[PDB]
């Protein structure tokens, strides 16, 4: 039930919790999912890459 992450695509809140849209390595946009922060504790690298792209377009 664990899969390799290619990159983080976007973020959103829903019902007061943060979710991140995940592009899964070896898959296409047809397989993207929204995942809670809890599931991404091993993804600190790609999350800070994402948050840096947000900060720069601002």
């Amino acid at each position: 039930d664990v899969f390799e992450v290619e990159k983080i695509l976007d973020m959103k809140t829903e019902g007061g919790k943060v979710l991140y849209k995940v592009r899964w390595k070896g898959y296409t946009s047809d397989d993207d999912t929204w995942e809670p922060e809890i599931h991404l504790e091993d993804c600190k690298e790609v999350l800070l890459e994402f948050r840096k792209k947000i900060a720069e377009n601002k």
Partner: peptide, 5 residues
């Protein structure tokens, strides 16, 4: 690596 739900 992440869990997929």
């Amino acid at each position: 690596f992440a869990f997929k739900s």
